[PDB]
């Protein structure tokens, strides 16, 4: 709260997590200050205003299986006393066209996804940064998977 009291959050993926996307804050150069909460793996917004929302995920694979592999990343918000969730940001990638044949090397591949934008948020919104294939997640290095918001006006 040494900054100018602006609500801010920058959480990273737990490296100790085993094939599952769990957001954490107690890290080097990861923050969570000025009212922003983290409940049920979601970011809780404290004030009405214009927020910058961003997130990056990194997927990794060795070869391609017989089933089609789609990688999605989506940031959504749930309003206060709200059943449905409206999607704010979303991106799709398709790293695997065909199955790796038998007798061919399972060559590695990498796929990042970045999302960012400015949205008006109300007090009590619950923001989520979700993926569809947690088993493909890659948090081998520090600054590869993250999820952050910061109020620009309030």
């Amino acid at each position: 709260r040494t900054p100018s009291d602006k609500p801010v959050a920058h959480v990273v993926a737990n490296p100790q997590a085993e094939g599952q996307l769990q957001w954490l804050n107690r890290r080097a150069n990861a923050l969570l200050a000025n009212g922003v909460e983290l409940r049920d793996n979601q970011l809780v917004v404290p004030s009405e205003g214009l927020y910058l929302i961003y997130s990056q995920v990194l997927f990794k694979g060795q070869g391609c299986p017989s089933t089609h592999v789609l990688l999605t990343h989506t940031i959504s918000r749930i309003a206060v006393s709200y059943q449905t969730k409206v999607n704010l940001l979303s991106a799709i990638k398709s790293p695997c066209q065909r199955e790796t044949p038998e007798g061919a090397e399972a060559k590695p591949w990498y796929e990042p996804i970045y999302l960012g934008g400015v949205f008006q948020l109300e007090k009590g919104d619950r923001l989520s940064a979700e993926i569809n294939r947690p088993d493909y997640l890659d948090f081998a290095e520090s600054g590869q998977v993250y999820f952050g918001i910061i109020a620009l006006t309030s």
């Epitope: 997927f59 399972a106 890659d138």
Partner: antibody, heavy 126, light 108 residues
Framework: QVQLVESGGGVVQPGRSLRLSCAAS????????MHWVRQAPGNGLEWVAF????????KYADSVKGRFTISRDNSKNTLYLQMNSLRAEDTAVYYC???????????????????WGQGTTVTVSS | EIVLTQSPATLSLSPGERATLSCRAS??????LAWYQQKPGQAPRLLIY???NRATGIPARFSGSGSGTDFTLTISSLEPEDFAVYYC??????????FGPGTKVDIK
């Protein structure tokens, strides 16, 4: 025609070293990952080591970490297990097996170990 | 981190009966699970891969099912050759490629 043939086992004393071999034939060995899996007398199966097609990824079980070293020769189509600092608990029959090496995030591996060698017996008497 | 349980330890049945083997994981492995058969004096043999897919050359009486933490291997009709030891293998990384305790299948 598709086969793995192992060798190198025998009776060894604790603290010594032994190197097991697994010669492949009938398939493109340079494209498959390889596993070492052992079975103690009267016990079940225990996974030992793993390496990818070019050796970029190596994995070891905690009980052998720091003592065993898996390696491979793609011109000879052979897999090797170097066993240093042998213990009585290493007494087992050792199998090698091939794997497609297709994985997600380097953590979850599809398919399975479909062809195996005949095994080679390692006894660590004293 | 993950512990595999296999029930029952010993299964004694007659030829023609249906065998139901259970493999449980302390934490979810999605469907990255395999089933191997080992007859006395032979190397293991891949039966099931990715929980439900039948390996090449495996008779149709073997079937796999389950997801997450619970997995099941069913042999609809025992043959005199099916009497062996059956192991499940979780194929995650923590710890990597762990085999279960095994289930022993005998006659009578």
């Amino acid at each position: 025609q598709v086969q793995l043939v192992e060798s190198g086992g025998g009776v060894v004393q604790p603290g010594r070293s032994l190197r097991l071999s697994c010669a492949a034939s009938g398939f493109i060995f340079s494209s498959y990952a390889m596993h070492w899996v052992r079975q103690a007398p009267g016990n079940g199966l225990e996974w030992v080591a793993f390496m990818s097609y070019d050796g970029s990824n190596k994995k070891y079980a905690d009980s052998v970490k720091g003592r065993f070293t898996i390696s491979r020769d793609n011109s000879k189509n052979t897999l090797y297990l170097q066993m240093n600092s042998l213990r009585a608990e290493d007494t087992a029959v050792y199998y090698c097996a091939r794997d497609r090496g297709i994985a997600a995030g380097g953590n979850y591996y599809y398919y399975g170990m479909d062809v195996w060698g005949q095994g080679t017996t390692v006894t660590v008497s004293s | 981190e993950i512990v595999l349980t296999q029930s029952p330890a010993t299964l004694s049945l007659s030829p023609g009966e249906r065998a139901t083997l259970s493999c449980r994981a302390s934490q979810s492995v999605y469907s990255y699970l395999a089933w191997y058969q080992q007859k006395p004096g032979q190397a293991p043999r891949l039966l099931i891969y990715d929980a439900s897919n039948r390996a090449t050359g495996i008779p149709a009486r073997f079937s796999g099912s389950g997801s997450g933490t619970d997995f099941t291997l069913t042999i609809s009709s025992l043959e005199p050759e099916d009497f062996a030891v059956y192991y499940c293998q979780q194929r995650s990384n923590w710890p990597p490629f762990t085999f279960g305790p095994g289930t022993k299948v005998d006659i009578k």
